[PDB]
Amino acid sequence: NNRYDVTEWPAGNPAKDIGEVINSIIADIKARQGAADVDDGGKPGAVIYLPPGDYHLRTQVLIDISFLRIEGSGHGFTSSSIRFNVPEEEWPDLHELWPGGSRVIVDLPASAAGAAFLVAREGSPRISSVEFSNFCIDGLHFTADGSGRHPENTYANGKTGIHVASANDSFRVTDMGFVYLENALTIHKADALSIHHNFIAECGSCIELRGWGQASKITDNLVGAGPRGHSIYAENHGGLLVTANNVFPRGASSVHFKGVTRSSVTNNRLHAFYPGMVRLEENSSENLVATNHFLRDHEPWTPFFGVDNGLDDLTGLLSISGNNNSVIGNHFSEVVDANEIRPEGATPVIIRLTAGTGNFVSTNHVVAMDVDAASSDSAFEAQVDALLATEAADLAVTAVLVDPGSARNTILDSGSDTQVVADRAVNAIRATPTVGF
Amino acid sequence: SNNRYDVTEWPAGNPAKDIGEVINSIIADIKARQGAADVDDGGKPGAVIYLPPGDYHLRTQVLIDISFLRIEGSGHGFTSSSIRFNVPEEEWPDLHELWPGGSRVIVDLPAGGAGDSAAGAAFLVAREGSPRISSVEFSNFCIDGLHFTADGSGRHPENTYANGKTGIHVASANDSFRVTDMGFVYLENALTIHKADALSIHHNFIAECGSCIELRGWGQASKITDNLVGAGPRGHSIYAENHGGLLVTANNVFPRGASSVHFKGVTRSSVTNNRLHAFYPGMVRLEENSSENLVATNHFLRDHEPWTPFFGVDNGLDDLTGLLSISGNNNSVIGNHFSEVVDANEIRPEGATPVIIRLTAGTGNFVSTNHVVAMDVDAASSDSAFEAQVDALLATEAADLAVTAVLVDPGSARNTILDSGSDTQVVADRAVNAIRATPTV
Amino acid sequence: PSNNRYDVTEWPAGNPAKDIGEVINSIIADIKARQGAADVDDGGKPGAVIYLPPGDYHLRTQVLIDISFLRIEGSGHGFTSSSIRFNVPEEEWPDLHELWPGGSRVIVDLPAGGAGDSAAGAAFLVAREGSPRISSVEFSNFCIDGLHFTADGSGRHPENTYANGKTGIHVASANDSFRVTDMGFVYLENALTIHKADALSIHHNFIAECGSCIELRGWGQASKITDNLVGAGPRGHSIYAENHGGLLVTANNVFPRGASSVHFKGVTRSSVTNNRLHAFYPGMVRLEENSSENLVATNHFLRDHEPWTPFFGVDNGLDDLTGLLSISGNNNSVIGNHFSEVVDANEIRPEGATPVIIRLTAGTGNFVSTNHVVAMDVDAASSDSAFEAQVDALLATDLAVTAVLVDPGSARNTILDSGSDTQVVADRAVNAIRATPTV
Ligand SMILES: OC[C@H]1O[C@@]2(CO[C@]3(CO)O[C@H](CO)[C@@H](O)[C@@H]3O2)[C@@H](O)[C@@H]1O
Ligand SMILES: OC[C@H]1O[C@@]2(CO[C@]3(CO)O[C@H](CO)[C@@H](O)[C@@H]3O2)[C@@H](O)[C@@H]1O
Ligand SMILES: OC[C@H]1O[C@@]2(CO[C@]3(CO)O[C@H](CO)[C@@H](O)[C@@H]3O2)[C@@H](O)[C@@H]1O
C-alpha cells in the first residue's frame, strides 16, 4: 500500500542509521514502481513515517523519486543554544538536554555531501511534489572554526538538513523543526514551492533558495539564524511571496534577495540585532516590501553580546539596489545605544537606496530611540525584558538615504525633510507634514 | 515501544467514559520508559497520542509535564451548538444531529475555585524548573464544553458563555508550542497560554467560546495566524498582555467577543491583514502602554447583532469608544478599511457622532491612509441565525452617516494623521499634531 | 470498525484501484449504519476518517457525502505538470521518469454532466438539506486528477482545451466550518466548487492546470482562502466568489492562466490582500455587480505575455482597456498595491490604445491610495521550453499607461498617489484627486 514506518522495516536499524533504513525503503519503492504507464498510472510514490524517537543518521538519504512524503509526529525543538551555555555542572538537574519529536540526528562529516536528505534527479520531467512534514532534524553540535566564540556558539558544522539540488516543482516543507544545522534548508531551482509553518531556529542559515526559481512561497514560519548566515535568502527568483513569517535574531539579515524580481516581502515580523535586515541586491527589481514590522536593537544575551554581522549603522535596516520597487506601509523601530553607533557620530540610516531608478517609498513610520545596551546571562528573561522596555530618549535618524547612484525615485510621507537625505532635483520628495499650521 | 499511542487501543479504563484517565495513564507510561536525558545523544523524545473520531468524555484533567508530546485527532468537529440550543427543544429529535463530533473531547469537569480557572481545563500544561517545557503540539481534534449554565445575567442558560471550563491551559513558561487545526466549542475559555515564546496558534476554528485565545503573563516572538475566531460578549477573541514581537495575521474574526483584538502592554507587534467583524464598539484595543505596534491593512466591520437571541446583548461600550482605540506611543495605523454600518436611532449616547479611531493617550502615533465608510441602516432582527447574518452582510443600500474618523484626546499629542478623514472627520488639536485631511471635492 | 477509522485499501471486497468511489460510498453506508442515534451519552454521530494511502485509484462512481464530520485524507498532493507532458512530443515519453500525477491519487473517470448538471461530473459531491447545515467536513492531502482534457471545437490541441466536464469536489448544500487543505487538483475542468459556505477555510492547497480552480457560489460568509498555489485556464476562474460577505483572500500565489486571478460578483465587506498575482491577460482582479466595501491591499500584480508556444495565441478575450483591476461597486479601498505591466507596445489591443491599470466603471466612494505602477515595453516571444521560458520572462527587465481611469458612471471617488496627473483619467469636478508628485 506504499506506506512505510522506519521502525517496521527489516533492513537496518533506525536508531543506529535511519539513512540506511530510508534508502532501503526508497529502493523498495523503485523496485515495485518500475512502469510509468500502466492503467493511467504506475509511479504514485509513497509515504515514510517516523514515529517520535531518537534516530541517528550516518548515511545521506538520496531522494530521486517524485511524490515521496516523509512525515513525523513532532517538530521537537528545544534551545540547544541555551543549554550549551548553561554551566555543565547544572546539566544533570535539567529535565531534558536534547531536541525530540521525530528526531533525525545528523551524524555526517562536514556541502551537499553534509546534507541529511539530498533530493536530486536529472533528466525529465522535474522531480515533483516531494513532501517533508512534521519531523525534527538536529545537527547536534556546533564546532570550532577559528571565530573564537565557544565551539557551541559558532553556528559551524558543515551539516545541512534538507538539500534539493535539482530543478523541482510543487515541493512542500511543512511543520518541520530544524536545529543546530549550519544550513537548515537549501533548495535550488524551485518552481511553485511552499515552505510553510516550520520552526527553523539556531541554524547558521535557515532558508536558502538558490540558483533560480519561480512562483514560490515562504509563509507562516518561525525563523532564527546565525550572525554569518541567512534567515531567508533567495536568488534569481521571480514571483516569490514571503509573508506572515516571524523572523527573530540572529541572522546576518532577515531577508536577503540577489537578482529577485516581481516578488513580495509583505506582512512579516522581523527582529534583528544588526543593521542590514532586508537586503535587495544585484538588480532586485519590481518587488513589493509592504506592511512589515522591523525591529533593530542590541543583543541582550551575554554569550553573543559582542558578536555582530560586521555592518555599520549607515547600512540601513532596508537596503535596495535595483529598479522600480515599492516600499509601502512598513513600521521601523530603531532602538540603539547612541554611544555605540558606528561610525562615531553618525546618524543611523533606516531605508537606503544605493542604486537603481523608479523606487516608490511611501507611508513608512520610523521610530528611533536611544537606550543603554543591557547584557544578561539568562536568555529568555533578557530577551523578553528587552522587547518590552520602552524607557528611552528620542533619537535623530535618517529615515531615507538616497545615494547619488540611485535616482528618479519617489519618496512620500516617510520622514521630514531633514530625515530624507536625497537630491530633490532628480527625485520626487514629499516630506511627512510637520506638526502645527 | 515506538512512542505512538491510540486512546482506543489502551488496556485500562474507557476513553468513552474518561479519556483523561486514559491519557494520564499513557503519559505515565511515556515517563516510565523515557527516564534518562542523555543516552546516545537523546532519551526523552516524547510521543504522540492519537484520538480517532469519536465521543470521549473527560472527567479527569490531563496533566502534560513533558516536552515533545503531540496530541492529535482526525476532525475539528465543529457544529453550532449555539444555534441548536436556540431551536425549541421539542424539535431536537428531528434534527440530523445535535452535537459536535470529530475527535471529540467532552469536558465534564466542574468549574475551578475563584482564581483557579486552571482546575477547569481539560488539558493543563505545567512544569517548573529548567529548561522550559517545549514543542508540545495539539492538532486537529475537538474540545467541547457541552453546555453554558445560568449565571445571573438574565440570558437563557445556553447563551451565557459561562461554564468555568477551559480547553487547553498552559500555566508554565513554554517554547515552540503549536496549536493547529483544532475545533473549540462551548468553553468559557478555549485556549489560555501563559509565558509563551515562539508559539504558533495556526489554522484553528475557535468559536462559541466565552473567550477564545488569551496569551497571559508575558511572551515573545509568537504568532496567531489563519484562525477562524468568534467569542462571547464579556470575553476576548484574541488577547495578549506583555508580549513583544507578536504577529496576528490572516485571521477571520467574527462576532461576538467584547473585542476582536485586545492588547495590554504589548510592544513591537503587528496586527495586520485580518478580517474583523464585531457587533459592538471597541474592536481593537491597544491599552496600558501598548507601543510601537503596526495595525495595518485590516478590514473592520462594525454593525448591529441581527440574531434575535442576542439582539439586546452587548459589551457595555458606547459609540464614542472607537472601533480602534490606542493608549500608547509610536504605533503605526496604516491602510485599514473601516465599515461603520449602524442604525442612527440605535447610536449611544443619544445623538452622538460615532468615533472610528481614537487615540486616548500617548505620543508619536502615525495614522495614515485609512478609508472610513459609514452608513445609516436599519436594525433588522431575525430568529434564523445564518439567514439573518448573510442578509445583513450583503445589505449595502443606505444613507450616509456622519462619523468622527479620528479622535485625538488631549492626553495624546505629537501624532501624525494623514488621509484618514476630512477636516470635519478629524477631531484633534492642530497645534500639536501633524494633520493632513483627506482631499475632498 | 468501532473506532471510525477506515483505509480504502482494507475495505472488505472493495477494489479502490478499479472504483474507489464505490469503496468510499460503501464506507459511508457503514458509518451511517453504526451512527444512527443523535443523542446518546451527549453524542452519537461523531463522523469518521477515511484514509487513502499513496496509490493510483480510479473513481467510476460519484462519492456522495451527506454526513457531518467526515474527513477524507491522504499522504500526498501528487502534482506533476500533465500540461507540460502532453505537449512533449509523444516519441520522447518513454525516456521520461514518470508520466502521471501521483500521491494519494483519485483519477476521475466520470462522464461529463448533463446540461446544467456539472455536479454530476464531480468526484465528490457533498449534499444534505434540512437542519442543521452539514458541518466540518474535511478534505486533506490527496490528489484529484481528471486525467485528460478533450476536444471542444476551440481548435486547440485536445490536452490544452481545459475541457472535460469533471469536478474534483462539489459542495451543493449550505455548509459550516468546512476545510479543504493540502490538496492537489490537476486536469479538472473545475477543481473545487462550494455553494452556500459559512466559515469555510481553503488553505495550503495546490490547485493547478484546471479550467477553473476555486468557485464559491450562491452566497456565503465569514470564509477564507489562504496560502494556496493556484493556476487556472483562459476561460475559467482562479478564485471566484459571489454574494459573499466577510471573505478573506490572502497569501495566495496565483499564477497563469485563468481568465482572471480574483473575480467577485456581489461580494461585500471582504479583503483581497497580500497576494501575489500573475496573469497573461487583462482583467486580473474583477469586482463586479455591486461589489462594495472591499479592501484590495498590498497585492503584487504582474501582467505580461504568455511565453510558452502552445498557448502563445490563446487569451481571455479582453483588451488592454479593461484594467488589471476593474471595480464596479461602492466604497471599496484600493491601497498599497504594486502593478507591473510588461507588454508589447506594438500589440496593444485595441490598435492605438493606452493600457489601463485600475478602472472604476461604476459606483461611488472608492478610495484608491498609494499604488505604484511600473510599465514597460517588451517584445512578445514564444518558445516551446516551458519552465525555462517562464522563469526567463519573469527575470527579464518605458511604456505610457493610464494608472487610474474613472468612467463617467463612477463618481465621488478619492484617488491619491496612484499616478501622475497624466496617468489619472477622471472628472476633476466630481472626484478628489491628488497626483503622485513628479520630477
Ligand atoms: O524567542 C525566539 C527563539 O529564540 C531562541 C532562544 O534564543 C536564541 C538563543 O540562541 O537567541 C535567538 C533569539 O535572540 C534565537 O535564534 C535563539 O533561539 C529559541 O529558544 C526561541 O524559540
Ligand atoms: O459565521 C461564523 C460562525 O458563526 C456561528 C453561528 O453564529 C453564531 C451563533 O452564536 O453567532 C456568531 C456570529 O454572529 C458566532 O460566534 C456563532 O457561531 C458558527 O456556526 C459559524 O461558523
Ligand atoms: O510555475 C507554476 C506552475 O506552472 C505549471 C507549469 O506551467 C503551466 C503549464 O500549463 O503554465 C501555467 C504557468 O504559466 C500553469 O498554470 C501551468 O502549470 C506548473 O508545473 C507549475 O507548478
Q: Which residue has the cell 533530493?
A: A119
The Cα B366–Cα A363 span in angstroms is 9
Enter the C-alpha cell of residue B441. 471635492
> Which resolution, in Å, applies to this structure?
1.7
- What lies within 8 Å, CB to CB, of B12 at 6+ separation is B22, B25
Flag whether residue B126 sits within 8 Å of chain A, measured between CB atoms. Answer: no
Q: A313 is in which domain, residue-wise?
A: 1-437
The Cα C323–Cα B288 span in angstroms is 46
The Cα B59–Cα B107 span in angstroms is 7
Residue B202: count other Cβ atoms within 10 Å of its Cβ.
22
Q: Please give the torsion angle defined by the CA atoms of residues A305, A307, A308 and A309, in that order, rounded to the nearest 10 degrees.
A: -160
Enter the C-alpha cell of residue A413. 510621507
The Cα B440–Cα B423 span in angstroms is 10
The Cα C53–Cα B50 span in angstroms is 18
The DSSP letter of residue B159 is G
The Cα A437–Cα A415 span in angstroms is 18
The Cα C255–Cα C47 span in angstroms is 36
Nearest CA in chain C to A217: C253
Closest CB from C54, C204, C370 relative to A362 = C370
The Cα C207–Cα C169 span in angstroms is 12
Cβ atoms of residues C243 and C289 within 8 Å: no
If one residue of B382, B384, B389 were mutated to test the ligand 2 pocket, choosing by the most ligand atoms within 8 A of its CB, it would be B389
Q: Please give the torsion angle defined by the CA atoms of residues A10, A11, A14 and A15, in that order, rounded to the nearest 10 degrees.
A: 90
Give the helix ranges, DSSP H, for A39-163. Answer: 80-84
Which structural technique was applied?
X-ray
The Cα A430–Cα A425 span in angstroms is 13
Flag whether residue B330 sits within 8 Å of chain A, measured between CB atoms. Answer: yes
The Cα B168–Cα B183 span in angstroms is 12
The Cα B346–Cα B369 span in angstroms is 29
Enter the C-alpha cell of residue C102. 501521483
H/E stretch holding A326 = strand A326-328
The total number of structural domains in chain C stands at 1
The Cα A50–Cα A132 span in angstroms is 11
Q: Which of residues 397-436 of C touch A (CB under 8 A)?
A: 397, 417, 436
A124 SS3 class: coil
Cβ atoms of residues A168 and A216 within 8 Å: no
What are B160-163's contacts with CB under 8 Å, separation 24+?
A: B161/B188, B161/B209, B161/B210, B161/B231, B161/B232, B161/B233, B161/B234, B161/B235, B162/B188, B162/B210, B163/B111, B163/B120, B163/B187, B163/B188
Q: After which residues is chain C broken (C to N over 2.5 A)?
A: 397
Distance of CA B327 to the CA centre of its chain: 21
**DSSP string covering A370-410, please?**
E-----BS-HHHHHHHHHH----EE---EEEEE-TTEES-E
Cβ atoms of residues A78 and B135 within 8 Å: yes
**Could you tell me whether strands A253-258 and C143-145 are parallel, antiparallel, or unpaired per DSSP bridges?**
unpaired
The Cα B120–Cα C387 span in angstroms is 57
Flag whether residue A41 sits within 8 Å of chain C, measured between CB atoms. Answer: yes
**Could you tell me whether strands B371-376 and B399-400 are parallel, antiparallel, or unpaired per DSSP bridges?**
antiparallel
Assess whether the C-beta atom of B306 lies below 6 angstroms from ligand 2. Answer: no
Q: Which ligand is nearest to the CA of C223?
A: 2
The Cα C358–Cα C318 span in angstroms is 15
The Cα A26–Cα A68 span in angstroms is 9
Q: Please give the torsion angle defined by the CA atoms of residues C314, C316, C317 and C323, in that order, rounded to the nearest 10 degrees.
A: -130
Residue C329: count other Cβ atoms within 10 Å of its Cβ.
27
Return the CATH number at B107.
Answer: 2.160.20.10
Give the residue, by CA position, lying nearest to ligand 1 atom 12.
A249
If one residue of C133, C137, C177, C221 were mutated to test the ligand 2 pocket, choosing by the most ligand atoms within 8 A of its CB, it would be C177
Strands (E), C35-178: 48-52, 55-59, 63-65, 70-74, 104-108, 122-126, 134-135, 138-140, 143-145, 167-171, 175-176
The per-residue b/e assignment along B402-433, b for 16 or more CB within 10 angstroms, e otherwise, is ebbbbbbbeebbebbbbbbbeeebbbbeeebb
Nearest chain A Cα distance for residue B83, angstroms: 33
Flag whether residue A357 sits within 8 Å of chain C, measured between CB atoms. Answer: no
- Optimal mutation site among B64, B220, B363, B412, interface A, most CBs of chain A within 10 A: B220
Nearest to A99 by CA among B70, B43, B72: B43
The Cα B60–Cα B149 span in angstroms is 20
The Cα A244–Cα B225 span in angstroms is 8
The Cα B16–Cα C107 span in angstroms is 38
The Cα A192–Cα C227 span in angstroms is 12
Nearest to C387 by CA among A37, A193, A207: A193
Nearest to B311 by CA among B252, B389, B253: B389
The Cα B139–Cα B39 span in angstroms is 29
- Optimal mutation site among B297, B303, B356, B375, interface C, most CBs of chain C within 10 A: B297
First-residue to last-residue Cα distance in chain A: 76
CB–CB contact A41 C278 (8 Å): no
Give the residue, by CA position, lying nearest to ligand 1 atom 22.
B198
Chain A CB contacts of C276 under 8 Å are 217, 239-241, 263-264
Cβ atoms of residues C139 and C180 within 8 Å: yes
Order across the sheet with C372-377: list the strands: C55-59, C104-108, C143-145, C184-186, C206-208, C229-231, C253-255, C276-279, C300-303, C338-343, C372-377
